[PDB]
Amino acid sequence: MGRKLLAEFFGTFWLVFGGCGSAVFAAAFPELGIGFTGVALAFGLTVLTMAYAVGGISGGHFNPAVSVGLTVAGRFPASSLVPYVIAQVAGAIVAAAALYVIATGKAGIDLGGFASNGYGEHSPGGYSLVSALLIEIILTAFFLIVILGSTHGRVPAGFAPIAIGLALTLIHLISIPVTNTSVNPARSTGQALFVGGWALQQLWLFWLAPIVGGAAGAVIWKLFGEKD
Amino acid sequence: YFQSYVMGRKLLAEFFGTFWLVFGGCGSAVFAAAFPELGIGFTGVALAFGLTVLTMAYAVGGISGGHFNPAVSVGLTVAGRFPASSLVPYVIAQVAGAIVAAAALYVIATGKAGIDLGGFASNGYGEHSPGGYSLVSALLIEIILTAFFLIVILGSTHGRVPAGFAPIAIGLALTLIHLISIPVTNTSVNPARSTGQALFVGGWALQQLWLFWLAPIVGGAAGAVIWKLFGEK
Amino acid sequence: MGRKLLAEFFGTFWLVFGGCGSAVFAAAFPELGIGFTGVALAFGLTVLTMAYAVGGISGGHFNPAVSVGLTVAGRFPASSLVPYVIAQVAGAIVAAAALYVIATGKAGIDLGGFASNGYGEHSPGGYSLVSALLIEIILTAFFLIVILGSTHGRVPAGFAPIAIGLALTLIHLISIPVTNTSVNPARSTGQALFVGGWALQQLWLFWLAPIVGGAAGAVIWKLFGEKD
Amino acid sequence: YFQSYVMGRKLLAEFFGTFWLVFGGCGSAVFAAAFPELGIGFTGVALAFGLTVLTMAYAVGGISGGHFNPAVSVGLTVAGRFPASSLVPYVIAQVAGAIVAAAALYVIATGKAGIDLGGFASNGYGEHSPGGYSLVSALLIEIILTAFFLIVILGSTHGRVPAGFAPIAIGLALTLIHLISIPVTNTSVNPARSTGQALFVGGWALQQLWLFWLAPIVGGAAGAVIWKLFGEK
């Protein structure tokens, strides 16, 4: 069990340090930077890679809304939920801090939103709170449908990391302009704690919406996918 | 053919999958393709469409067959992989999934007011081809691209290839198809995908829609006929 | 055997119509075009996808220099070499022609080099004939090392298309500026026949260099990789 | 540990693989990254480096273990996956492969005369960090990135994951590492890769080279130590 919490901790750290750190260091670099596509690929590849490295140890959730959805689907014991959520939020916070220390090694850098998720005025594209809510619920619900589908016994072992990592990239290709893309309450919490201000005031949305999307995808999955 | 899952489950699978294909491929185009400085361009859209299929073919492919595409259902029927008796119900689940995804995209887009959605990721030709290509060019490239899409689907799901790899060959073939043809038609190869967007644009998009039923369905049947000639036995 | 020639024909057609057609229609499209990266990804994905669809029928060479390298490696009967080369060059020519018909459906388009490979003045980056020669030999030799390695019995079945497709993308990411990237005599012949002029005068280089690279990679492979 | 292939074959495998990693990752950077209008950028370089490893790990991974990287050989020794007695010979084959690839890139580049190769894809820090990041930033990010590279290599090659998927997790993890850190150090995580380029630039690149031996090797050992704590049993 301690092995499983460490798997979640290192995994969520990798997710945030790789995804957010590609956003902070590289996305807007002049002439050669990696754009929304490269951040999207980054975040999907943190999940693909640690899903292969530690998924067979903890299940490789790396994401509170995943742990909730897999509990609602009856794949995962509700008794492990809270500990997993604590291990995950701790990895995110420790990654946010390592990124912070490294980022400021560049003289007079402006961290800005520091890859925090936001809506309205803090939506990259100026989309409303209601747009933010709907798209985070829809995308997280589908994220769980892919995770529950691709880890079902009808799918041969070993392919789920590819499915689930690249589904995370696809989710970023769709929604970065709307919310910078959360679908993961832990991945939103670390960056926001370093920004404070508006980032903390909007943080609730990125706990509430992914958790409702993850639970909804679980319920939908149960209705047509999980039975033999 | 035998039944492996009851029809309601296969139809929901097809409904949710085609919803994902349009919501993710058309959503990436509407929200992110042209975003100033950092937007994802034709490349990021092609990746997104391929990934909706790769990820839903893994998620529900084992339930319905994972068509998400009337042209694919038709091609597999012509190749003798799928029963004609399931054709019409699948096509209806797929077109319903695409219309509901278009509507969902629209609702989310209204949260950024005063914005012009332009063609709303609709397919088109002539003045409505991103590069000004003619109706004949559109017709040809949709026939050839959908035919090869069918040949990749049929060969990668054949028993001579190990289970589990199809979603990756099929989803990446769709990304490849958009890399080639977005400048020509915005890329259909999928009558349901063309239909939901066009119903919201109306006008020229409804008027040109016929072509993105006819060409993909012709190409899908042609791919299937070609495959049965050399690949299936 | 007729099944195998048709596999090669459809395969090389897909390679050229997908790769070259991504170059002609999309690579330089204003604001949104796919650049050298998207052409590189295109060409690798034609091979990955048709290697899965028909590789188990003909071996999925799609490329005269592959057929030569696999013959030199003793993987493939020298008696099938010529027929495979004819089927491959025929797919390329028929794809070049379909691309031609479709491309000119755009009023007053300038086809330009029409994705032909070239060197010196016709190298995108102005690299010399000698640069062109060396990089086509090196990259084709490695292409065969990957193909022979990834289809060896020590590698589990089904992964070779991923290896070999993405190796082709990697080769394009390295060399498009130097020669537009051939590593495939058939893929160079179709486009050049439609351009004539300098494209025909340089065509020999793109037969000679990939065939020497493919044969060399086969010989190197035999020395350290092919034995149990 | 038992012998599966004789040492000459393992060394040639490592030599050719590290040659490919530098020739393809550094070649893509030198020839294509900054090409006017169509160049491939930090994204295309990160993809290229990841793909040299994915494709050579499939091609010769089954012969030598597919390290291509002194930091990887060290990490696997510390994790008890590889014998210390093979360490020095591997590291020498890898550094030789990288120097010969640098030389090969150089020869090909001379065919476009009067050109400035700049840093020639060398790694660096401070003034020689593409984004001006300090020595401490460089050191930290190379330790953390190489440690995770080791954790992904160790977990994906563990017996609890099916054979054949490692080249894909390991090569894509390298692409991810470049997506994160090219702005900081140009991305090393690999002392042999840093060494060949720097020997051609001389000057500051030879002077800063120490850091791209020390940090990757420290991070590789740390990743291995962490892995043995929770992952291996």
Brief descriptors of the model:
homotetramer; 228 residues; mainly alpha; Glycerol uptake facilitator protein; 9 helices; globular; transport (chains A, C); repeat (chains A, C); transmembrane helix (chains A, C); Aquaporin_Z (chains A, C); membrane (chains A, C)
Describe this structure in words.
4 copies of one chain form a homotetramer. With 228 residues, chain A is mainly α. Chain A has one domain: Up-down Bundle (Glycerol uptake facilitator protein), CATH 1.20.1080.10. Helices cover 70% and strands 0% of the residues of chain A. In chain A, helix 3 runs antiparallel to helix 4, helix 3 runs parallel beside helix 9 and helix 5 runs antiparallel to helix 6. The longest helix of chain A is centred in the first third of the chain and has 25 residues. The radius of gyration of chain A is 17 Å and the shape is globular. Chains in contact: A-B, A-D, B-C, C-D. The PDB classes it as membrane protein.
The count of β-strands of chain A is: 0
Distance between the termini of chain A: 30 Å
Instruction: Round the Cα radius of gyration of chain A to an integer and report it.
Output: 17 Å
Biggest interface and residues each: A-B, 50 and 44 residues
Helical amount among residues of chain A, as a percent range?
A: over 70%
CATH-defined architecture of chain A: Up-down Bundle
Note the quaternary state here.
homotetramer
Alpha-beta classification of chain A: mainly alpha
Beta-strand percentage range of chain A: under 5%
Can you identify the CATH superfamily of chain A?
Glycerol uptake facilitator protein
Could you give a short account of the major beta sheet of chain A? Answer: none
Number of structural domains of chain A: 1
